[PDB]
Amino acid sequence: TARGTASRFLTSVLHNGLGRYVQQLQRLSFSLSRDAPSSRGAREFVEREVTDFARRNPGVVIYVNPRPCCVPRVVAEYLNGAVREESIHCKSVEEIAALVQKLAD
Amino acid sequence: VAIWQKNFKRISYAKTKTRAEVRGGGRKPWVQKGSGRARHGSIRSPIWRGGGVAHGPRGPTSYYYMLPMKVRVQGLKVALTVKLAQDDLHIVDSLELPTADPQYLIELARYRRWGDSVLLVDLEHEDMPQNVVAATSGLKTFNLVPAVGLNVHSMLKHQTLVLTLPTVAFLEEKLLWHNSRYTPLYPFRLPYCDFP
Amino acid sequence: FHVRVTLPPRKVVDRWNEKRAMFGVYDNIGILGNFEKHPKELIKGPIWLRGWKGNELQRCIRKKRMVGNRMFIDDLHNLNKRISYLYKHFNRHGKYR
Amino acid sequence: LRSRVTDRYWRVQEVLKHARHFRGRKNRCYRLAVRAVTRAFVKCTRARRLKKRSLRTLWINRITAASQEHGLKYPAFIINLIKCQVELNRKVLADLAIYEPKTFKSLAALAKRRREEGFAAALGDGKEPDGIFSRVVQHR
Amino acid sequence: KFTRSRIPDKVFQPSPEDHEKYGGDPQYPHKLHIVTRIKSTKRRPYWEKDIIKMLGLEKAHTPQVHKNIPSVNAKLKVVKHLIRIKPLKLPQGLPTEEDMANTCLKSNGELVVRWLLN
Amino acid sequence: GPRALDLLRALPRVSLANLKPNPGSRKPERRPRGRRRGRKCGRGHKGERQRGTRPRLGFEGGQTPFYLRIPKYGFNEGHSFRHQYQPLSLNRLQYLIDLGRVDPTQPIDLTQLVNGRGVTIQPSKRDYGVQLVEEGADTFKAKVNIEVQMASELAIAAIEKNGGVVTTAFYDPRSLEILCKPVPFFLRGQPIPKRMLPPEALVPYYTDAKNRGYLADPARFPEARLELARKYGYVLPDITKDELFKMLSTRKDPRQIFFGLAPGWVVNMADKKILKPTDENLLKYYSS
Amino acid sequence: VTYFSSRKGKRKTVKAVIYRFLRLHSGLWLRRKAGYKKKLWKKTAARKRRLREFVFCNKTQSKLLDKMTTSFWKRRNWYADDPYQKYQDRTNLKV
RNA sequence: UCGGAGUACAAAAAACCCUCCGAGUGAUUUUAAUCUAGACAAACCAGUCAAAAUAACCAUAACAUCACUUAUUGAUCCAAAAU
RNA sequence: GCCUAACGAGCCUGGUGAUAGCUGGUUGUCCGAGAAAGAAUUUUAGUUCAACCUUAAAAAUACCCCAAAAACCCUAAAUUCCA
RNA sequence: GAUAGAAAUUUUUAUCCUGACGCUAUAGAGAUAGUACCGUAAGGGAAAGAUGAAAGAAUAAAAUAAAAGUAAAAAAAAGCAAAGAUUACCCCUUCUACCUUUUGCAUAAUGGUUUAACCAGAAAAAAUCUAACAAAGAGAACUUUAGCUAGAUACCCCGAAACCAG
Ligand SMILES: [Mg+2]
Ligand SMILES: [Mg+2]
Ligand SMILES: [Mg+2]
Ligand SMILES: [Mg+2]
Ligand SMILES: [Mg+2]
Ligand SMILES: [Mg+2]
Ligand SMILES: [Mg+2]
Ligand SMILES: [Mg+2]
Ligand SMILES: [Mg+2]
Ligand SMILES: [Mg+2]
Ligand SMILES: [Mg+2]
Ligand SMILES: [Mg+2]
Ligand SMILES: [Mg+2]
Ligand SMILES: [Mg+2]
Ligand SMILES: [Mg+2]
Ligand SMILES: [Mg+2]
Ligand SMILES: [Mg+2]
Ligand SMILES: [Mg+2]
Ligand SMILES: [Mg+2]
Ligand SMILES: [Mg+2]
Ligand SMILES: [Mg+2]
Ligand SMILES: [Mg+2]
Ligand SMILES: [Mg+2]
Ligand SMILES: [Mg+2]
Ligand SMILES: [Mg+2]
Ligand SMILES: [Mg+2]
Ligand SMILES: [Mg+2]
Ligand SMILES: [Mg+2]
Ligand SMILES: [Mg+2]
Ligand SMILES: [Mg+2]
Ligand SMILES: [Mg+2]
Ligand SMILES: [Mg+2]
Ligand SMILES: [Mg+2]
Ligand SMILES: [Mg+2]
Ligand SMILES: [Mg+2]
Ligand SMILES: [Mg+2]
Ligand SMILES: [Mg+2]
């Protein structure tokens, strides 16, 4: 609902894309577990595609943390100072790659 | 088989009181018309506060069912087969033990990379070696059971299986008999021609 | 909907205690023991439910037939009323008929 | 096994978070909030459907305003702009009217000129005499 | 009682002026019908609904090509008040197998085989 | 062979944490909760159906029911007193013999058929034994001594062409159940009772020679055998000159149940002993 | 029909169906024509033949009788000299 | 409760406390059988026809006939019958 | 009339969770298809069938349907059956 | 008719292994208690507790300040009170509250002041799916012309005037 939630105008930070394009995603911190069955997607993404994604996008700092946790999460922190925390709990590697690409974009 | 072993022994001792078993509520609280409030019968109705439960759990519930013989035996065979295939089944001879130290078994399992839990299976109960009895009487993850105590639930609960050679022969001869047997005219307990 | 404001103490339950280790150990006693005892004898509980299953009406009838003479007065009366009610509901009430 | 609901707080809050800006007891009482929230969502969908029509009518009104400001009626302006194969929608036409007075006057002059061209063609009823802006160009 | 309507054969007897009024050839009839559904089958009889369904005209304002045979002409006469029918025109001939992907149907009723050359 | 075993090596441990039943083995139960399965919960609108007070099955709303308007006629009249005989085809008998369930070298009885699982007899269902049919009499090539309760002429001729022996006897339900399940009778703890005579309805059937009655005159037997032989056009073998003539001629006493045993004997299977009565009255009763 | 008995808790059967019906093992039910013994002097010979002749029951009545009768009456029956033994089975049913 | 006519104009069905006829049986001899394809009608119960083949009469018909011929009739159970 | 504030027959307990074709209520999300009535019935406030309809499975023909064809005093819109 | 329903005849091996896929103060016994209280009497019959090792640590200390109801902070044309929005709370435009019952309900037909806690689908004869074995199936009694066994799919709550017994 427009009247219930907030609103904003179509804006861009630092007039992005005018002089040069700068990837607004600054860092991506994955928190997962090695023994939790829910962290299977996060684990297999770390094994397979985290290196390829890091090589494709060198402007983002990728942290990976195994810990005794039940809900695997991803914290994306942008140049705006904005922090978006998403749950990667029980998602396949294709879904995790799609979410990571969406966060980067 | 795993679900059957968990369920057939269940008897739920959950019994709640219906509106007919509650103490009071023998008369109408108020007349049908003229009071201006809702009509009610017994004050122990499930709508009321201190009334009985509409359906609830009723009495001791016995969850008992028997899977067929050739399904239980097949489940035992499949459990043994998967334990052998996943490099988790070990055949030990005579189940002899040098000392009654429970910690010796833990070190032996750690050195052989058996895992966290080990199920030792012996042929008989009264013929168990006292060293192994004393060693496994104080251990939790190491469990000593006789040949007649083999079950799918325990084989899946324990990470590694250890079988004695006479126990292997006994289980082999027990499980292979059902492949070429008749239907029981009477229960196999009573004397047969070739069956004891 | 007022939920509690403090975390409950974590129930430290061990999955390797005596019962959880010995559970279901002799379920194949017949199969691996030259049949002499059914798994029926391993059922511990009420006398009328040792190796039997049925709906509520059948359970009540069976309970009255075996242990009905040793019951208490009020429980026997409640059992009779429950038997009558279950009979009436099962035979005269329903949708599929 | 007695089973009770423990997340009823969150179940109620998921509905009450959309009714915090309401007036009266509808923003507090849950019984009065579910009906108000459901009607709010239904109205949101209906108004999302009607927003296109409302904005189109607003654009048409603005195009009229800017057209009779040039002494030209909206139907004639639109039909003569279509006849010139100038496919600018009402939103763009209103944008031009608001922010590009000279461009909109050029469009109005073109539409008018097309109108007198069509009127002269109808009066003459001659196949050979054709106007300059009345020529039709095919796809390429 | 409201039943189906018999249409006399005198309705389909074209007059000499009809040919030059509607741009038809008085001596060779055309080959294929381009049929478009204008109106809805709601508030119309179930037999007309069935005829529209079997003519492949579920979606309105979408042309469909049919033969010029009396078998389909009977149904076209049955539901002639719900459809617009034009003769298929082929200024450049039938499309061969090499022009199937580059064909188009102009709204005037003709089928062009070479559409958007480069 | 079983490549699933090889594939299991790379897969993790199979434990109770990862166990899934067959897809489609368990149809999920549906409860009257929510927008779809609520709002009268599938019971419809008002009436007897929603309130659960509709009439019984055969009731048709006051109209005379179909199951009450049709006139009564004898269809199951005395159905619990008609003798039943489980049929045994010659094709099935041949199948049993050639798979080795039953052996023609020994006398084959209803006991032997039950032991070989060729037939199943339920005495409580008024079954009176096994009858012989001629479904596979064309390819019956075994020489077997068959004892049944009912036999057909074609089956008898087919057996006699090979050179067997057919004999039909009677068993009252008690002796019948004893004969089907001798072991459960032997652990019962009672002496073997006498075999009761057939009733007047079955005396003529077992007194004649054409059906090979056990109470028939044995001197009439060769006459009937020769009649069947001349009727079916097969040479009648000289059975007296066979090496198994004693086995083929081995009979049971009309009061006897088993082969070689006598009424009144107690078979103690624990000690492998036989207890026989000696009292004059007991012997007279058991031999009467 | 008593779906759950009071003594044993089993499912009882109505005796009228077994008294005036016969079930074949193929699933069909056998019954007599209604009125085959009433006022024979008032009826034509063909009508009397139709009344005397046996008839079958369709799917609805067959299902009703199956519901109203216990599975004991649906068993395979081998009577001695049974007239309906030839009709117990079904042949050449292309369905 | 059952039949006929119009409503219900031309395959079938079709209602009203819609408009009219009736029926709850008589007379006579050709005293009119058994069995079985295939069909009409119908929610069910019921009602209808009926080719071929057999028993007795011409050695060629048997549908009993007439009264607008269509209606002239009643299910289980149970009682009396005695096949 | 009165029989402890309600008496065309007191109040309490038990049968009793009396029985209701009658009224009210029946609690998570999404998706697919989807029904307005012919016959009986102390029956028209309901049940039981048929015709529709839902989930599965077998098949092969299914709607539109040109001729030709469907009654005798007169009879319209038009119906049935089929390429 | 609804329904009721045997018996003759069969099977049943000693003891421990007993606790809880039962509840946590609107639940579980009515119970902190058959006590207060209501009744002449028979009889009916409840609600009520929360700090801490220490309150012989009350100038006493720490976690929520989250339901409905109020105050902080009464209101400014116009309208089922909301949505589209907008620089902007209204002002502009558009939608006849919700269940139930009905051919049809905004109807001036029924129900609800509000909040919290309780309150309403239950059965496996025939059938579908899955699996074991299969002319045989089932751990005893039965069913079998591809069948037998096992498991999963199913059928509510409240309400009378009344009748009988003490
Ligand atoms: Mg009570
Ligand atoms: Mg009372
Ligand atoms: Mg009031
Ligand atoms: Mg009451
Ligand atoms: Mg209480
Ligand atoms: Mg309680
Ligand atoms: Mg749109
Ligand atoms: Mg259920
Ligand atoms: Mg269901
Ligand atoms: Mg619903
Ligand atoms: Mg609702
Ligand atoms: Mg109704
Ligand atoms: Mg009546
Ligand atoms: Mg049998
Ligand atoms: Mg028909
Ligand atoms: Mg003839
Ligand atoms: Mg009084
Ligand atoms: Mg009730
Ligand atoms: Mg009613
Ligand atoms: Mg849909
Ligand atoms: Mg509708
Ligand atoms: Mg025609
Ligand atoms: Mg056709
Ligand atoms: Mg009656
Ligand atoms: Mg309490
Ligand atoms: Mg508050
Ligand atoms: Mg306003
Ligand atoms: Mg309702
Ligand atoms: Mg009304
Ligand atoms: Mg309705
Ligand atoms: Mg009104
Ligand atoms: Mg109102
Ligand atoms: Mg009302
Ligand atoms: Mg309501
Ligand atoms: Mg009100
Ligand atoms: Mg079943
Ligand atoms: Mg009475």
Side-chain angles (χ1 to χ4, degrees), chain B residues 83-95:
Chain B
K83 270 303 193 304
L84 183 63
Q86 287 178 319
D87 301 358
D88 301 338
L89 176 54
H90 298 308
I91 312 298
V92 183
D93 43 359
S94 62
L95 185 63

Side-chain angles (χ1 to χ4, degrees), chain F residues 24-145:
Chain F
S25 66
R26 311 196 68 266
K27 199 168 304 177
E29 70 174 9
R30 315 273 189 191
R31 299 182 59 248
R33 301 294 178 272
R35 194 193 90 260
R36 183 254 186 267
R37 278 159 190 91
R39 203 208 183 192
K40 308 153 207 316
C41 311
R43 286 295 216 96
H45 210 259
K46 298 188 290 291
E48 275 175 321
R49 43 199 64 184
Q50 182 188 6
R51 303 181 172 96
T53 310
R54 44 170 50 172
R56 51 190 184 274
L57 271 163
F59 201 76
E60 292 175 340
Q63 182 193 241
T64 312
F66 167 74
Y67 83 103
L68 285 188
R69 183 177 292 171
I70 298 294
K72 286 183 174 180
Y73 174 62
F75 283 115
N76 315 296
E77 182 87 70
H79 90 295
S80 68
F81 309 123
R82 302 200 200 105
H83 307 152
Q84 292 196 25
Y85 304 93
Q86 187 76 250
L88 176 59
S89 48
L90 300 199
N91 194 18
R92 177 163 182 80
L93 191 57
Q94 183 70 25
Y95 173 80
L96 304 174
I97 286 186
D98 294 90
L99 275 296
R101 293 180 181 177
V102 294
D103 47 336
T105 56
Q106 296 285 336
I108 284 186
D109 207 46
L110 188 153
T111 307
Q112 294 306 307
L113 297 171
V114 167
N115 290 268
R117 324 285 172 165
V119 299
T120 313
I121 296 300
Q122 311 95 341
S124 76
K125 294 294 173 290
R126 274 71 71 191
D127 214 317
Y128 264 65
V130 168
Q131 76 166 2
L132 278 177
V133 309
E134 51 274 7
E135 190 277 331
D138 279 1
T139 74
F140 187 74
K141 296 292 318 192
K143 315 160 46 58
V144 56
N145 165 81

Side-chain angles (χ1 to χ4, degrees), chain F residues 238-276:
Chain F
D238 210 4
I239 185 171
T240 58
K241 292 182 175 66
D242 213 358
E243 59 155 329
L244 300 168
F245 175 75
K246 185 48 68 182
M247 182 270 298
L248 294 179
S249 316
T250 305
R251 295 291 185 269
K252 291 183 182 180
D253 205 48
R255 304 291 221 170
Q256 186 187 1
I257 312 297
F258 303 101
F259 271 130
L261 294 180
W265 292 0
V266 178
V267 189
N268 183 18
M269 293 177 71
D271 294 7
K272 318 295 183 178
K273 300 281 186 176
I274 310 296
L275 304 178
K276 312 172 179 175

